[PDB]
């Protein structure tokens, strides 16, 4: 017993809201899409193949769930979650005068069974030395102490932290490192007079 | 209480429809644990025994029992420093390395004494 | 080079948690050995192969439960059947040589 039912395109109202049809990421069933679309290479007299049974359209990632109406709606639903950005911070100058310390952190998304990315551990600490309370002696001693992690032209100190399994651990270790650098830059010792 | 469980099951049975949309599929899947959490953080699922960076970097505590001035300090401070840089290992494992060395050196006292340095 | 520079360097290593006391080029290898994942432990190494036993076994069973259909195994079968019919089979173990 052979059953052939006409496609949804027949029952489709002209003004029917589209995001109703493709709320989520979808394979592109040709039956559920109203637009005639021919893709494929043609043949000498012929045209591009029809949308029905077309394997090539099936390969295409389709942005059909993301049609701009659907985005407007989506975002307007998301306006409730987002929190505002503080006014006075609008310029970088004030950013530095208020917040001296930048912590860079990477997060990676790749498709597959496992989430685990080795590169995610790394935490980078960038800090201007002009925003620190250092003495002349202490500043010179810190510069010599850290060495290459200090850029002499831009005055931005860099701490790259790797060694620990978690990014939170590495964040703590970079902060700790910074703390200790500052505490041990101000201590004068015996051999410093030599 | 098996009866409370069959009650929660009989309730969850009237509660559970076959999914009415994709967003529903994804919601149930996420709560289930099948789907991923977003926005993605790769460290999700793994906290590493709630350890903190000082139980990683500073291994001095386990060198307490070991000869303090010898070449054994040299060697073991190298091993130590190595483990200090090692991301792929847990705290437990590092300590197990340390202890294997404790046990192996304390296994051979003889060869160490004969070696030309008296070693504890 | 000075004593000041060396004191500074010693302090730098001790601080950042790198090797404190002066070592040979040859001995530093030790640190390297524990800094890394030993070669035979990497997932690229011990996990290299897919388990072929699980694939072959599982799809065999699923064939016998009549879910999976293996045309290759079917071909092998029918060929073999026709071969035992024609009279050349596989000798039962121990029988072939001496007899």
């Amino acid at each position: 017993r052979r059953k052939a039912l006409p496609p949804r395109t027949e029952k489709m109202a002209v003004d029917q809201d589209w995001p109703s049809v493709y709320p989520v990421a979808a394979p592109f069933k040709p039956s559920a899409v109203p637009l005639p679309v021919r893709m494929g290479y043609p043949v000498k007299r012929g045209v591009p193949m029809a949308k029905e049974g077309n394997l090539e359209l099936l390969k295409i990632p389709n942005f059909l769930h993301l049609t701009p109406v659907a985005i407007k709606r989506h975002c307007e639903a998301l306006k409730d979650f987002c929190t505002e950005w503080p006014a006075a911070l609008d310029s970088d100058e004030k950013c530095e005068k208020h917040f001296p310390i930048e912590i860079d952190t990477a997060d990676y998304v790749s498709a597959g069974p496992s989430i685990r990315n080795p590169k995610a551990r790394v935490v980078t600490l960038r800090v201007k030395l002009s925003s620190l309370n250092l003495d002349d002696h202490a500043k010179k001693k810190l510069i010599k102490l850290v060495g290459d992690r200090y850029c002499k032209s831009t005055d931005v100190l860099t701490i790259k932290t790797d060694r620990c399994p978690l990014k939170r651990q590495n964040y703590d270790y970079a902060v700790y490192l910074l703390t200790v650098l500052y505490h041990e830059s101000w201590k004068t010792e015996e051999w410093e007079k030599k | 209480s098996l009866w409370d469980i069959e009650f929660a099951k009989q309730l969850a049975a009237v509660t559970e429809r076959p999914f009415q949309n994709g967003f529903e599929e994804m919601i149930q899947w996420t709560k289930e644990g099948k789907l991923w959490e977003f926005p993605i953080n790769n460290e999700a699922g793994f906290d590493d025994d709630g350890s903190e960076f000082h139980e990683h970097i500073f291994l001095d505590k386990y060198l307490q029992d070991f000869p303090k001035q010898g070449p054994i300090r040299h060697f073991m401070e190298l091993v130590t420093c190595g483990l200090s840089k090692n991301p792929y290992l847990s705290v437990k494992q590092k300590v197990e390395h340390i202890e294997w060395f404790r046990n192996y050196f304390n296994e051979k006292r003889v060869i160490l004494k004969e070696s030309g340095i008296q070693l504890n | 080079l000075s004593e000041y520079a060396v004191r500074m360097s010693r302090l730098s290593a001790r601080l950042f948690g790198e090797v404190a006391r002066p070592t040979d080029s040859k001995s530093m290898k030790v640190v390297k050995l524990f800094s890394e994942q030993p070669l035979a432990k990497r997932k690229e190494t011990y996990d290299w192969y897919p388990n072929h036993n699980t694939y072959f076994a599982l799809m065999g069973t699923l064939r016998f439960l009549g879910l999976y259909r293996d045309e290759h195994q079917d071909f092998r079968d029918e060929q073999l059947r026709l071969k035992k019919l024609r009279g050349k089979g596989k000798p039962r173990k121990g029988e072939g040589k001496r007899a």
Binding site: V180, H183, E184 | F58 | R10
Partner: peptide
């Protein structure tokens, strides 16, 4: 030659480092 004393423990407990 020279062996200088660096205190791991002092800076440790102080900075939450032990």
């Amino acid at each position: 030659a020279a062996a200088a004393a660096a205190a791991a423990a002092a800076a440790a407990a102080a900075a939450a480092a032990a």
